[PDB]
Amino acid sequence: VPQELIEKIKLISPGTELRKALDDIINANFGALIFLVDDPKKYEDVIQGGFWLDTDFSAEKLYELSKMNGAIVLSEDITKIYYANVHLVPDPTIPTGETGTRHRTAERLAKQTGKVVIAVSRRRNIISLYYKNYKYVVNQVDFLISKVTQAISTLEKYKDNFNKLLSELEVLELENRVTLADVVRTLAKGFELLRIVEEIRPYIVELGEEGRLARMQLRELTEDVDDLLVLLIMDYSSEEVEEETAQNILQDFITRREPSPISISRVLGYDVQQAAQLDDVLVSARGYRLLKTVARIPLSIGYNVVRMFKTLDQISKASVEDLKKVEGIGEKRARAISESISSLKHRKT
Amino acid sequence: VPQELIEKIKLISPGTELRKALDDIINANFGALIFLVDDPKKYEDVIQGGFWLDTDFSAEKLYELSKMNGAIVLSEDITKIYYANVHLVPDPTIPTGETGTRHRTAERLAKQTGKVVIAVSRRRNIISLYYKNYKYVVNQVDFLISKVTQAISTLEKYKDNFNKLLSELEVLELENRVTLADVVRTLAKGFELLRIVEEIRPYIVELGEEGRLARMQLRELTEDVDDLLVLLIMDYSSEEVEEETAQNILQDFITRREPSPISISRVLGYDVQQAAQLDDVLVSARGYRLLKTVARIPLSIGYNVVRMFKTLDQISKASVEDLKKVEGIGEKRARAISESISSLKHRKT
Ligand SMILES: Nc1ncnc2c1ncn2[C@@H]1O[C@@H]2COP(=O)(O)O[C@H]3[C@@H](O)[C@H](n4cnc5c(N)ncnc54)O[C@@H]3COP(=O)(O)O[C@H]2[C@H]1O
């Protein structure tokens, strides 16, 4: 959905005065047909009759005028009302898929002029926005909130299972018994969780001001999942992987490819041909996830720790003195790394 | 009913574009509140909000605008629409006996400004016009046609009875056997008939263009009745009476006085006070009616004929040469007088 169209959709999103007027208009079962132009006298050929108003916009003015027959003409920034009660006469030969004079008009005029045209039929409660060759249906808030509330509830469940996989993996990681299946299983759930966020995003945008709470909820639920999945990819890919590449992996399984077990492992660099093989492939975390997340070591410095000790298992055996020999590890980072690991080994294993 | 107000009623009479709009508005159960001014600027303190239109009037435009809440402001000549959807704010302390905000505003505003205000409420089908301290309710054509059609039917019955009275009177006149009762009975019926005409006149006016057939019917039924009654009065009053005098006696009995038998015969100059006396009072026509109406002798000249012969009976005895002595009677008018009376005597008596 092009950014160009999204800007226009904002014009009629909950919170704006225009949308507040359309809401009333929908509720009164008036229809509406609204033409958005900045230079009215250039569109003189497609606007016939009606009254020339040239007055400052308000929701209540628009509502009142919509009681009259025909169409309304506003400025593109919704600051002026230019015409009311007009007859819009776009070229009849422009192809249209719409039904009814109102919507067929809106589409043809939108195509003819490159401007926004808004149509509301008298008995339906949707707002149809036409821009160029685009058509976007904007839904009522109760409909959007229902989908979003379900989507969030769905996310809670994915997120709970992600947490349970993660904490199981944590244990395996600290005991160096991780198989590729555990890794892939965790990544896949994380991927799916983030896909859901991607799918619900348009509804949330569409909700405008009424989606503030929903955004906070998605934020709380997913706030560090992406960074976590990036560090998992860096800890378990077959060949060393820069952060940027790991993020591109994440981005791939969120959008382009489908997060299937075999596919994820293949992208991680493992020549596998069947899911049952994943349980036999032993792997060891390099230690980035633990070093960044728990020891608060910046990734830049993380690499230096890994280049030296290669795996988390070795890092967990290093003395403070050993760890200080790494570039970037003073006495505090050294004890942060060593105590955070021994603390986790004690508590979790 | 002041002529000032009658000019305003014309504005909304059948046939005008304004009335046409108002009929549509009544038909659609929209309401209306309309304010007629010549300089909107002068009245900007009683006009709040709404839309400045400043566009040419049409019925369709007024109809469309009336779909909106509030009031409409037109020029007094009903050639411009100035405002729509406005809030009218006349002085709340001005007395009014109207009901509901719409009609209380209308009457206060008209009183305050000296202008016309029109109110139509949504559920009734009347147009209320307010001018200064005047209120005039204008009716639908179908209500008016009903009363007028009845009035006409009533006039037909009065006119037939009048013709019967007259034809009997004629016979009596020609045989010189008329009594006061016969005259008074005929005048009374004539007076009552023209009263009915006077009373239905306001209905006729309210009908405007739709009153055209009604006016034609009145004209045909009453064509010569006034002249006829004037001539009767000149012929039968106690002492001789000038035409314009008799015209006033007609005016009196049509408008201000009741055409009771004693009242009529008293003002004709007879000293009776009991209705039964009229049968015993013998009268003889001067001859004006027969002279003007049948012999086609102009009143100015008939005076001289009555001057000389005094009564119809004596005129009917005069020979052509006898008549020719009168100032104005040549052989043409002399044979006209002579032959038309004798012709009448032959056929009627
Ligand atoms: N060229 C045509 N061809 C075939 N049928 C025609 C027609 N024009 C009108 N009709 C019929 O007349 C109905 C009444 O239109 P109305 O002007 O009162 O009310 C219109 C009008 O206010 C608005 N509308 C539709 N097209 C418009 C346009 N090009 N410009 C301004 N307003 C339009 O939508 C309202 C509902 O129109 P709706 O189609 O449901 O209903 C239309 C349609 O059924």
UniProtKB/Swiss-Prot annotation, chains A, B:
Its EC number is 2.7.7.85. The keyword Transferase applies. Residues 2-142 form the DAC domain. Its cofactor is Mg(2+). Crystallized with Mn(2+) to trap in the pre-reaction state. GO terms for biological process: DNA repair. The keyword S-adenosyl-L-methionine does not apply. InterPro entries: DisA (IPR050338), DisA_sf (IPR038331), DNA_integrity_DisA_N_sf (IPR036888), DNA_integrity_scan_DisA_link (IPR018906), DNA_integrity_scan_DisA_N (IPR003390), DNA_integrity_scanning_protein (IPR023763), HhH_motif (IPR000445), RuvA_2-like (IPR010994). GO terms for molecular function: adenylate cyclase activity; ATP binding; catalytic activity, acting on DNA; diadenylate cyclase activity; DNA binding; hydrolase activity. It comes from the Bacteria. SUPFAM superfamilies: RuvA domain 2-like (SSF47781), YojJ-like (SSF143597). Inhibited by 3'-dATP. 3',3'-c-di-AMP binds at residues 70, 88, 101, 105, 122. Consists of three domains: an N-terminal globular domain with diadenylate-cyclase (DAC) activity, a central helical domain and a C-terminal DNA-binding domain. Participates in a DNA-damage check-point. DisA forms globular foci that rapidly scan along the chromosomes searching for lesions. Homooctamer. This is DNA integrity scanning protein DisA. It comes from Thermotoga maritima (strain ATCC 43589 / DSM 3109 / JCM 10099 / NBRC 100826 / MSB8).
